Design an enzyme around this catalytic site. Structure first.
Site, PDB file in Angstrom:
ATOM      1  N   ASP A 167      -5.678   6.073  -0.823  1.00 21.22           N
ATOM      2  CA  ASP A 167      -4.816   6.470  -1.916  1.00 21.22           C
ATOM      3  C   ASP A 167      -5.642   6.447  -3.165  1.00 21.22           C
ATOM      4  OD1 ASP A 167      -3.024   6.852  -3.927  1.00 21.22           O
ATOM      5  OD2 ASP A 167      -1.659   5.234  -3.346  1.00 21.22           O
ATOM      6  N   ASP A 199       3.268   1.073   1.047  1.00 19.29           N
ATOM      7  CA  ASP A 199       4.208   0.593  -0.001  1.00 19.29           C
ATOM      8  C   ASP A 199       4.741  -0.813   0.337  1.00 19.29           C
ATOM      9  OD1 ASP A 199       5.703   0.631  -2.266  1.00 19.29           O
ATOM     10  OD2 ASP A 199       7.192   2.106  -1.579  1.00 19.29           O
ATOM     11  N   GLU A 258      -1.828  -0.917   0.436  1.00 20.01           N
ATOM     12  CA  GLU A 258      -0.676  -1.752   0.019  1.00 20.01           C
ATOM     13  C   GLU A 258      -0.094  -2.532   1.173  1.00 20.01           C
ATOM     14  OE1 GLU A 258       2.353  -0.404  -2.684  1.00 20.01           O
ATOM     15  OE2 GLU A 258       0.935   0.895  -3.731  1.00 20.01           O
TER      16      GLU A 258
END
Ligand SMILES: [Mg+2]
Lengths: 251, 250
Positions: free
Chosen positions: A153, A13, A43
DNA sequence: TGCAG
């Protein structure tokens, strides 16, 4: 045990700038605790990966881009010998997504390691499914002597894998193979994880690991998996809005 | 009516066909809905010239003086003006900016904002840099103001997730009101025939962001509707976008 | 100023 491969897969994130430095230190604490042989990250941003390269010096790093946000593979130098890497493009992504691949030797065996952060959001089912087909094809076609591990992901939701006809013969989803345990099913859970504020509660299994054994050797099984990162850090937030996966294999 | 009401609408001033008839269309909506605040995008001088003549109940602020630009109209009987400013978007290629008007509404400070974020599917990079500027200004607005941003954001859902989502304390009104299916798409080439294209696209480009004031009880949206979804006498819609009407529990 | 399911 020694010949056992360990991995961590985690969307860190990096697009959430709030307490990002403290959260990168948190990631590093988990890496020191678990000492995984391979780390698959999603990310990342340049400042984050620069930090990891300063701290996690026992790993060799590969990234899916040099700017924006991107994926990474970290290889533990004392355990995993790097051979080669490549990036495969996703022609129709609107979000700079791609497929990062590293070929390595581990415990006398070739591994073909892959990660991606598939197209985001419920409404991008079509593009995400297109990317999934590319990932599954690359798994099927990988060098016959290699064990293939994809971890990333996937943003996948209910019935999207069923709708492509399921995983191909020889490829399993590790969480499925380990018994479909509810205790370690949901890797994105907005009720449990307070990092993002959201109008509606949801739990999804976005982070997944796919395994293919070598076509020319006895198959290997996963050993154990756990979700990690369910502690808050000193700053009062979690490392990520996702939980990480720690998984071992009987290599 | 203690309830604050707003309309936000991209008027499609770049489409000059039947532009005077379409401005008359907008004015009919204003006469009916009598919103406290109107946030408009893609005005051109001919268009705003007409509106200023007709909509005499409103004080007008414009985001530029030529080309096409945004505007905020304030209902003089309901809203007292304090100050306005324009924040430049340094890397826009389409003269986009952020227009802010600070006002009081029965004594409660409102911090009103509008923008037309960079247009076109392939401009996600500049559009999201602008979105970051918008969300930062909503976060930093004075503690004693209710913030309402309303504009043509050109956003796709993933673009918002890909900046980290909306900041804590900030909601998207359509989401907050329950993600209702029949006030979802605001630019819809199947339902709206003003743009002649051979494909179906249904996009939620027009959005409202809300933040409460710390100094007052939290504000919730009350009701929302999409407007403009009927042909005018000239046989075209007021715009290629639907307008948003929304009220708030203030 | 090119969807979502
Ligand atoms: Mg337009």
């Amino acid at each position: 045990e020694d010949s056992k491969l360990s991995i961590i897969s985690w969307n860190v994130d990096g697009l959430d700038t709030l307490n990002l430095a403290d959260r990168a230190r948190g990631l590093c604490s988990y890496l020191a605790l678990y000492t995984p042989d391979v780390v698959f990250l999603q990310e990342l941003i340049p400042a984050y990966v620069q930090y990891l390269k300063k701290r996690a010096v026992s790993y060799l790093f590969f990234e899916g881009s040099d700017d924006g946000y991107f994926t990474g593979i970290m290889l533990r130098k004392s355990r995993v010998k790097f051979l080669e890497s490549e990036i495969i493009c996703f022609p129709t992504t609107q979000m700079m997504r791609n497929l990062l691949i590293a070929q390595v030797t581990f415990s006398g065996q070739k591994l073909y390691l892959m990660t991606s952060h598939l197209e985001s959001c419920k409404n991008q089912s079509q593009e995400r499914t297109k990317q999934l087909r590319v990932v599954l094809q690359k798994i099927k076609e990988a060098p016959e002597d290699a064990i293939v591990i994809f971890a990333g992901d996937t943003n996948l939701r209910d019935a999207e894998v069923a709708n492509v006809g399921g995983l191909p013969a020889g490829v399993c989803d590790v969480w499925e193979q380990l018994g479909k345990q509810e205790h370690c099913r949901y890797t994105w859970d907005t009720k449990a994880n307070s990092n993002k504020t959201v109008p509606y509660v949801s739990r999804c299994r976005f982070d997944r690991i796919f395994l293919r054994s070598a076509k020319t050797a006895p198959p290997v099984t996963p050993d154990h998996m756990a979700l990690i990162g369910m502690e808050k850090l000193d700053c009062g937030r979690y490392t990520s809005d996702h939980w990480g996966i720690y998984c071992t294999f009987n290599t």
